[PDB]
Amino acid sequence: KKAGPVQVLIVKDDHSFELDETALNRILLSEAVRDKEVVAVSVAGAFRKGKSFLMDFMLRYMYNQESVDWVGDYNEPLTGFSWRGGSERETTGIQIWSEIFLINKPDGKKVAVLLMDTQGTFDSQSTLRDSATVFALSTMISSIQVYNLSQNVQEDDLQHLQLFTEYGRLAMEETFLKPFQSLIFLVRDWSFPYEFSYGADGGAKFLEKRLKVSGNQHEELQNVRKHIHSCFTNISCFLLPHPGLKVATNPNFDGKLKEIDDEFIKNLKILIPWLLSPESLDIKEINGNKITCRGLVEYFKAYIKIYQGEELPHPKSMLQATAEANNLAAVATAKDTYNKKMEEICGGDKPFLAPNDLQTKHLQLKEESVKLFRGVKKMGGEEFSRRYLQQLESEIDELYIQYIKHNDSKN
Ligand SMILES: Nc1nc2c(ncn2[C@@H]2O[C@H](COP(=O)(O)OP(=O)(O)O)[C@@H](O)[C@H]2O)c(=O)[nH]1
Ligand SMILES: [Mg+2]
């Protein structure tokens, strides 16, 4: 029925990660949105840090682009669809919004925006692994990762980034492109507007001090500061102020808007567009290929097989995963091209085509669609690629078959 948060990936108590593929397919494989280039916005962070709360206002904005006052009526309590849904009942894992959002970039492109909520605990390793895995995945998939910290970017906050740098540096060498898109530090209750101002301007001078290496204090947090900037195309920071005390000292805050502090609402109002304004949306791209919702479904499947058991994958294994998904996505794109181009000539209905003619069109469009497959960059390497080549040839042969059926409907 109506939209709500659907728990697509969950961490099992046995330390294994189960991905509800079916729900993922309902959402991203729907015909309306399947073929759209995709923006994947994820918020990740500790439990009980104001994530859902924020993500509300992200929905309020998405369902109300037109409004100047999407934030809502001040004398009315906050209402609308809710990420908090059933109160937690909190478990490490990833939630996505049941409704994908369709939006036009300034250049007329109709993109799909996917909202991810990433919940995990960050305290004990047997509990960090899962979190760092959920975090890994979350970041791997997302085009935009907003990292939701409480009061400051702390060393332990920067620690969870360690897992990427190893994999980044590796991916970077093999692809010759930086591996991740945008990472955003969202500092939650900033209390030094006199040291750095709230919002992006100020958030950025803050992040520059915090990320600068060689307090001499840091240890192998040096390694992260050293390489963090090479792994991410862009890294930014937003200083968000305290919601006021009615919001902080209450669970499932049911108050009216006026209850929320003014400077929190002031700044919340620039923040959300900042992240999800049409100009600000960043299309997910791996290797320099833009990714399709269908395409994105491949990367889920691939990365999930990797994080099985307590042991975490080595960059090398992750890398190989990215190769699978990257290769698969090329198949779908090339097969889509063949399929859609064939549909004109063969016809959704009409008109008649002589058997030998269908033959000659098919194999040229098959050879040429295979060429496009070869054209796209492949993570793994030709040898690794070649197994997928066959798959594409085989998937096209079965599409050919289906098209002789249709063709052979002219008496
Ligand atoms: N101190 C503080 N508390 C907040 C903020 N935003 C929300 N809260 C409150 O903190 C509690 C946890 O927020 P919640 O939405 O459940 O975040 P989540 O549990 O991480 O998804 C809720 O009762 C909120 O009412 C914030 O920016 N600062
Ligand atoms: Mg949440």
UniProtKB/Swiss-Prot annotation:
Description of post-translational modifications: Phosphorylated. Phosphorylation, by different kinases, of the N-terminal hypervariable region (HVR) regulates the ATL1-mediated membrane tethering step.
UniProt keyword annotations, A-Z: Acetylation, Cell projection, Coiled coil, Disease variant, Endoplasmic reticulum, Golgi apparatus, GTP-binding, Hereditary spastic paraplegia, Hydrolase, Magnesium, Membrane, Neurodegeneration, Neuropathy, Nucleotide-binding, Phosphoprotein, Transmembrane, Transmembrane helix
Effect of residue 37 to Q: In HSN1D; shows no significant changes in GTPase activity and no changes in endoplasmic reticulum morphology
Main location: endoplasmic reticulum
Cytoplasmic side: 1-411
Pathology noted in the entry: Spastic paraplegia 3, autosomal dominant: A form of spastic paraplegia, a neurodegenerative disorder characterized by a slow, gradual, progressive weakness and spasticity of the lower limbs. Rate of progression and the severity of symptoms are quite variable. Initial symptoms may include difficulty with balance, weakness and stiffness in the legs, muscle spasms, and dragging the toes when walking. In some forms of the disorder, bladder symptoms (such as incontinence) may appear, or the weakness and stiffness may spread to other parts of the body.
UniProt protein name: Atlastin-1
Classification of source organism: Eukaryota, Metazoa, Chordata, Craniata, Vertebrata
Name of encoding gene: ATL1
Region of the whole protein represented: 30 to 440 of 558
